[PDB]
Design a protein around this ligand. Structure first.
Ligand SMILES: *[C@@H]1O[C@H](CO[C@H]2O[C@@H](C)[C@@H](O)[C@@H](O)[C@@H]2O)[C@@H](O[C@@H]2O[C@H](CO)[C@@H](O)[C@H](O)[C@H]2NC(C)=O)[C@H](O)[C@H]1NC(C)=O
Ligand SMILES: *[C@@H]1O[C@H](CO)[C@@H](O[C@@H]2O[C@H](CO)[C@@H](O)[C@H](O)[C@H]2NC(C)=O)[C@H](O)[C@H]1NC(C)=O
Ligand SMILES: *[C@@H]1O[C@H](CO)[C@@H](O[C@@H]2O[C@H](CO)[C@@H](O)[C@H](O)[C@H]2NC(C)=O)[C@H](O)[C@H]1NC(C)=O
Ligand SMILES: *[C@@H]1O[C@H](CO)[C@@H](O[C@@H]2O[C@H](CO)[C@@H](O)[C@H](O)[C@H]2NC(C)=O)[C@H](O)[C@H]1NC(C)=O
Ligand SMILES: *[C@@H]1O[C@H](CO)[C@@H](O[C@@H]2O[C@H](CO)[C@@H](O)[C@H](O)[C@H]2NC(C)=O)[C@H](O)[C@H]1NC(C)=O
Ligand SMILES: *[C@@H]1O[C@H](CO)[C@@H](O[C@@H]2O[C@H](CO)[C@@H](O)[C@H](O)[C@H]2NC(C)=O)[C@H](O)[C@H]1NC(C)=O
Ligand SMILES: *[C@@H]1O[C@H](CO[C@H]2O[C@@H](C)[C@@H](O)[C@@H](O)[C@@H]2O)[C@@H](O)[C@H](O)[C@H]1NC(C)=O
Ligand SMILES: *C1O[C@H](CO)[C@@H](O)[C@H](O)[C@H]1NC(C)=O
Ligand SMILES: *[C@@H]1O[C@@H](CO)[C@@H](O)[C@H](O)[C@H]1NC(C)=O
Ligand SMILES: *[C@@H]1O[C@H](CO)[C@@H](O)[C@H](O)[C@H]1NC(C)=O
Ligand SMILES: *[C@@H]1O[C@H](CO)[C@@H](O)[C@H](O)[C@H]1NC(C)=O
Ligand SMILES: *[C@@H]1O[C@H](CO)[C@@H](O)[C@H](O)[C@H]1NC(C)=O
Ligand SMILES: *[C@@H]1O[C@H](CO)[C@@H](O)[C@H](O)[C@H]1NC(C)=O
Ligand SMILES: *[C@@H]1O[C@H](CO)[C@@H](O)[C@H](O)[C@H]1NC(C)=O
Lengths: 728, 6, 728, 6
């Protein structure tokens, strides 16, 4: 009987989680920012020196957005004039500062409106992208060498990704890769010449008399994709008297006979590089392995060292093919591939040998490979206690595959079941992040022993604050359908009395390989809804969800908006059947894919749901981007899968919306899930005479994330749910 | 297409 | 105690008003369409022949949209494939049918996608516009002569108006004018070369993968206007061996010194034409009068027949300068100009004499001049009983200006106080339309006597149906502020008991020279709200409104969004002070200007209003079109009126919206009041943390008039008001 | 700019 977690507590963010962001710089040292001073810590002893002071940059003139320190410790890069673009893209202005002669480099500077900058992995070489072309500085103060001359806005991208490669394949803006010691600079080139444009209005400040038309190259499903080429250049031999030479590496021939994508690049040695290509139909992919050919100056990929990867149940990879982790000499590598019974486990390849050996098996999956020493491989899996929603660190003895040790399972089993890890330069040390179900907890260890050194941060500060307030509790469990378990989670109001009738909100995402039921600790809108409003907020990982092996994941292949939507309605039934749920007060809501599902559910006429809220929903797959949509659905042609494209729209169910209260929300400057999608739903409902409310957000994008908008939307939704649930 | 993020 | 006028009665349109649309063809004959047969009636006797049967066009192949019959009765023009554009613009396909040889003209036909067609005033000559160029057919079956060769989409308009001339000046798409006997074809040419483009997305059927960007030449306030030129061509001398000669008529040097508009053209005689030009700053205008010069072959306008018209209290004309009505010989004309004390009355000019004589005076205004005989001038005014909201026909003896007769005042004084008129070819007969306050009533008369012949239609059919239902009643009265009367109207629920507390909706427009308080009979949304929901629906004509002389109209000059908005709040107070109004249940709503006012009122923080609905509101004048906005506000520059532009936005009042319930609605394909306007409001409110609801309408325009949208919006608004007024 | 009318 204290106070609750209120809407303002969420929106104004009164309960802050503390982090411990460190950046490893050596085998035994890391950097950490403390009330605006970057300090260097000694991993072993925990003692720390001041590396650079908040004084230094008082009279810089500009507001500094982000630092970045050359590997060799000699220089420090300063980012200002940050201006966001898409998910990961942006532009900025940059200044380099020499830490020896305590000063700013004043001449031969980086241009304003630079699109990407990166240090070399060792030393202080710099590569940057400006107006879609690549440039290299060998020394901070010397002039930069121009590498590419073809760069052209919205057409040719040299060293940075276009829209769809940024969002759907590389998850980065950067499309360049240094070799390990920094001799070579590899890079991709994207040609968007015939990629159609999406166009939408942008209104700006009220001072702008005529609205602007943003126009962007964006391939919708079945449309014309970009094309790609890959080069490697040698930075040691740069002339200043001659243009640089860039060696092409062609795609494999199996790729060339049709549309394709470059989807992974991984350096293996100082003179060996590995590429992974993927066919536009994403169930066949090919790894190449290339060596520098001293004699001839070009790169050489023996078809003998090729590597195929394919599927017939679905697509290759969780989202794209996995990345190889090579051994020091680079003649073998480990890579997470899906096994005989469809579980993702670590495989061990020789570079010129078709066949690999699995080094793990089980009814569980490896999440990712985290480090490689000469006789230990560290990895993360969801094996512990057979729960897919949990995450732990493991090491496996290379010389003996049955010697697997769990490094995190029993460190603190009640508070900690969701680990992630950051290793030191040669896996001499490692930091664990535990993010649930307790308050996050960061520790530090030595690898020699697996000995826990110190506690770095434990949020005990926050912990005092939180017993003063009536928090909700999280249940994590499963139900059974057709003798497979499907997991679910529930946010339960404080003093949850299991013999009362609570109203229930189903919080959905449900996209392929997603997982909404996990052990993570979160302070979010659901927290408010349970704590202050006594609503049970549930999520269900049905068919299509990941980390539970391929039989469950690939069950929706070529068939989107069918099973994963049914299973959400099913889980809803099972929840009311549990007795503590108000049968006639069930809602549903989601964002993106989640908005689509929500909408398809409300459109299903199942009677289970009173109302729903769809935020930036997909409404028909032909509108969404190609790389993503086709990965699951193939092409929308009669000879392929057009029937399922047509069969799976939201607008075909307009008529059934007569039985629910619907709330549609979309940002007008959404470049991802275009406004088009919601605009087409709304029209369909109007034509069939169904009532609902829409709500646009002027100039907001797919995040609806600007400060005032974020506040406004969560408020508008809260009020809507309360009213639909008859809460005062 | 990725989850609404924390 | 029967049934009420329900929302469905409005939306499904169950209570139809009957009309009597006749089209005069001679001195004594007219045409009337009946059960799909065009009949010709004899004005004197009332007997009628069948002119053309519904049989004729059974196998036309196409659905016929509209007829149009050549003056000489010999041919009939058929409109199909109608496709709407803006307010009055559209395109269509056309077929001519020869009524003598009972057949369709099969060769030398009018092109599909014709933009305008018109017969000559006598005979069967045709002029049409196609791809922005003018063409002439002397005979239906012969080939057409090309007149203009400069026509170019969105740039050069020959014979048709651009966007802003269509909407704001001519109120028509057509920009060509035949001489009386059809010798000459006058026409305008608009050059939009440097007129900025407005652009907005259009989504289309869900089948359309990428949205379309509509882009339109549209000059916002202060921006770059079109330019215009005026030509006259002779159709008798058309060659078919030579391009046809068009004689330009330059324009007054007093206009050429700066931006200007062509705003009226009126033929006076067979060889005399009158033009009215207007300066971009609309308080100075000039009439020219031009004669054909047989020798030179040109048109010459002597500067000593020019005629200036200006203002210092405001702008020239109600919306534009009035049109002259010449005498048969064309040496004098009558024109409605504003007099010494600011009342609009009929003036009498000689073509070459600066000074005119007023032939009417009084504390009332002439609405329009309707006919001219050799010794009688027929006109319409709001003089009867000193009420501005009423309308009656009058005739004035030319030879004696004190001989004024009222032709309609006492025909039926209880049912009929809003007349309009249609005269026969030489004012030998005339049809009166009475449209309130009783059910509309159409009669027919002879001018020789002013003798009433027969009743044409009286809606007695509808009258039976209506006593079965509990209708509302309309009060029309005034209040007094600062010793001037300002009129208002109220729609009162049935069995209105003047000692109960009713909730009140203020229905606003309030733009310059508007009049919402009149004697017209209407069946509309207000009817439903009063009859079925017992809401008093009121409207008030405060400052800026027209028909009450210039002191009231020009009171807002250079000062929009100040007085007219205050006066609406004032009238609201006075209404609650009347005692039969629920003090704490007052709403307000409007469309266009009305939406702007509504919004400015809710933003005023006056506490008088619980809630409001703004449909397609203007939000800041710099966004609206130039011809209209500047007419009242001048240019948005520091040397002119920029201060008042900035001082008068809706977004500056965002903060005060915290005290009201707001509903914002806008069509996404509004080409008139661009979506931009509402999008900017919504953003302003979000940034200040105010809650409200928005509602877009996919691909709807300024009308929100498509069948299903019209139904949907009126439903959505009704529910909103009911809820805000705590109604069941 | 004009009043609309059903
Ligand atoms: C943090 O301190 C270390 C080492 O000091 C530690 O020595 C251990 C053996 C142990 O007794 C412990 O308690 C003691 O505090 C610094 O090491 C430094 O490394 C170089 C090598 O010549 C020199 O700069 C220092 O003199 C040297 N110290 C010693 C005694 O070897 C270390 O730099 C410091 N870390 C930071 C950067 O904060
Ligand atoms: C980046 O853009 C700015 C913005 O105009 C340029 O600014 C001028 O030059 C100096 C750079 O040190 C600024 O501090 C001044 O404010 C600017 N001069 C003016 C407008 O008077 C700047 O030069 C650009 N910088 C680079 C890296 O070229
Ligand atoms: C980084 O790696 C590359 C591996 O090739 C090294 O480059 C070679 O170095 C030797 C000695 O300098 C030369 O003889 C070769 O010709 C180089 N290869 C070419 C053609 O670039 C480079 O020296 C390495 N950096 C180190 C270890 O300092
Ligand atoms: C890649 O996926 C497609 C579809 O999943 C597989 O299918 C071929 O699809 C076409 C079109 O429906 C049919 O005509 C063929 O019969 C299918 N062949 C097969 C093998 O099933 C395709 O085979 C997959 N290819 C790979 C390499 O896995
Ligand atoms: C209608 O238009 C014109 C002008 O009123 C008439 O033709 C003119 O006739 C006069 C007097 O007979 C001639 O001197 C001119 O040569 C004609 N005017 C011009 C400039 O062409 C014509 O009579 C009238 N229409 C008809 C056919 O009656
Ligand atoms: C039309 O309006 C203009 C502008 O409103 C009038 O000129 C203004 O009035 C007086 C005398 O010219 C000055 O005090 C203002 O500065 C003028 N304003 C400006 C900046 O133009 C003019 O009287 C009117 N009629 C015309 C142009 O003949
Ligand atoms: C209508 O009738 C005209 C015939 O003349 C007589 O018509 C009687 C109906 C009657 O009223 C008499 O006074 C008339 O003298 C005829 O010439 C007209 O052309 C007719 N008009 C039409 C369209 O049929
Ligand atoms: C009366 O006139 C107006 C209304 O016309 C009103 O706003 C004002 O405050 C009063 N006084 C004067 C003389 O301005
Ligand atoms: C090298 O780059 C070229 C792009 O084709 C030319 O534009 C440029 O002139 C050339 N310059 C040098 C340094 O040789
Ligand atoms: C900046 O740095 C010093 C160094 O320890 C620190 O004590 C001081 O409080 C800091 N001030 C801020 C907030 O920048
Ligand atoms: C079982 O299989 C699936 C759920 O995984 C579903 O399609 C089907 O309807 C279920 N029905 C039964 C009773 O087997
Ligand atoms: C044709 O006209 C007659 C009226 O005389 C009527 O009976 C019939 O309904 C009409 N046909 C059409 C097209 O409705
Ligand atoms: C207009 O379109 C139709 C479609 O068949 C075509 O047959 C015809 O030739 C066109 N008509 C004209 C008048 O050119
Ligand atoms: C007439 O019009 C244009 C001149 O602007 C030209 O291209 C065409 O050749 C001319 N032909 C005739 C019919 O005299």
């Amino acid at each position: 009987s204290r106070k609750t977690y209120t809407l303002t507590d969420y929106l104004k963010n009164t309960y802050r989680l503390k982090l411990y962001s460190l950046r490893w710089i050596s085998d035994h040292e890391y950097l950490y920012k403390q009330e605006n001073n970057i300090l260097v810590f000694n991993a072993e002893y925990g003692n720390s020196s001041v590396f650079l002071e908040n004084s230094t940059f008082d009279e810089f003139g500009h507001s500094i957005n982000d630092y970045s320190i050359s590997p060799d410790g000699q220089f420090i890069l300063l980012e200002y004039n940050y201006v966001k673009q898409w998910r990961h893209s942006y532009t900025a202005s940059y200044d380099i500062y020499d830490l020896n002669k305590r000063q700013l480099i004043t001449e031969e500077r980086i241009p304003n409106n630079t699109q990407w900058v990166t240090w070399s992995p060792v030393g202080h070489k710099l590569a940057y992208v400006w107006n879609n072309d690549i440039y290299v500085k060998i020394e901070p103060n010397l002039p930069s060498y121009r590498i590419t001359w073809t760069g052209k806005e919205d057409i040719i991208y040299n060293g940075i990704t276009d829209w769809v490669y940024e969002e759907e394949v590389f998850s980065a803006y950067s499309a360049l890769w240094w070799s390990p010691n920094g001799t070579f600079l590899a890079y991709a080139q994207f040609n968007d010449t015939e990629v159609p444009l999406i166009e939408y209005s942008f209104y700006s400040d009220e001072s702008l008399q005529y609205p602007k038309t943003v126009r962007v190259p964006y391939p919708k499903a079945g449309a014309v994709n970009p094309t790609v080429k890959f080069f490697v250049v040698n930075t040691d031999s740069l002339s200043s008297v001659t243009n640089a030479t860039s060696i092409q590496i062609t795609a494999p021939a199996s790729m060339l006979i049709g549309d394709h994508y470059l989807c992974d690049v991984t350096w293996a040695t100082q003179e060996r590089i590995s590429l992974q290509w993927l066919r536009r139909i994403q169930n066949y992919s090919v790894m190449d392995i290339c060596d520098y050919d001293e004699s001839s100056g070009r790169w050489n990929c023996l078809v003998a060292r090729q590597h195929i990867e394919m599927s017939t149940t679905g697509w290759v990879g969780r989202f794209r093919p996995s990345e190889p982790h090579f051994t020091l000499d680079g003649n073998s590598f480990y890579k997470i591939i899906s096994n005989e019974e469809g579980y993702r486990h670590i495989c061990y390849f020789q570079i010129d040998k078709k066949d690999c050996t699995f080094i793990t098996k089980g009814t569980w999956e490896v999440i990712g490979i985290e480090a490689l020493t000469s006789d230990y491989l560290y990895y993360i899996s969801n094996e512990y206690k057979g729960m897919p929603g949990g995450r732990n660190l493991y090491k496996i003895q290379l010389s003996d595959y049955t010697k697997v040790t769990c490094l995190s399972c029993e460190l603190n089993p009640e508070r900690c079941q969701y680990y992630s890890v950051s290793f030191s330069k040669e896996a001499k040390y490692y930091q664990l992040r535990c993010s649930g179900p307790g308050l996050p907890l960061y520790t530090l260890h030595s690898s020699v022993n697996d000995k826990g050194l110190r506690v770095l941060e434990d949020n005990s500060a926050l912990d005092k604050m939180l017993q003063n307030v009536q928090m909700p509790s999280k249940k994590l469990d499963f139900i059974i359908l057709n003798e497979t378990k499907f997991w679910y989670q529930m946010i339960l109001p404080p003093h949850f009395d299991k013999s009362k009738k609570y109203p229930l909100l189903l919080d959905v995402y449900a996209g392929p390989c997603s997982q909404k039921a996990d052990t993570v600790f979160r302070l979010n809108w659901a927290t408010y809804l349970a704590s202050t409003e006594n609503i049970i907020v549930a999520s269900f990982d049905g068919r299509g969800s990941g980390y539970q092996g391929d039989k469950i994941m690939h069950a929706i292949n070529r068939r989107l908006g069918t099973f994963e939507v049914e299973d959400q309605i099913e889980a809803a039934r099972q929840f009311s059947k549990m007795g503590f749920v108000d049968n006639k007060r069930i809602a549903i809501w989601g964002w993106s894919y989640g908005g689509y599902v929500t909408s398809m559910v409300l459109g299903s006429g199942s009677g289970v749901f009173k109302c729903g809220i769809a935020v930036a929903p997909v409404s028909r797959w032909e509108y969404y981007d190609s790389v993503y949509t086709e990965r699951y659905m193939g092409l929308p042609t009669p000879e392929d899968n057009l029937d399922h494209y047509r069969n799976s729209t939201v607008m075909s169910r307009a008529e059934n919306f007569k039985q629910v209260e619907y709330l549609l929300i979309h940002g007008t400057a959404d470049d991802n899930v275009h406004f088009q999608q919601s605009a087409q739903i709304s029209k369909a409902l109007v034509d069939v005479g169904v009532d609902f409310q829409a709500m646009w957000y002027t100039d907001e994008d797919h995040g609806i994330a600007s400060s005032t908008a974020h506040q406004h939307i969560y408020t508008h939704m809260s009020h809507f749910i309360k009213q639909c649930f008859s809460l005062p | 297409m990725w989850p609404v993020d924390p």
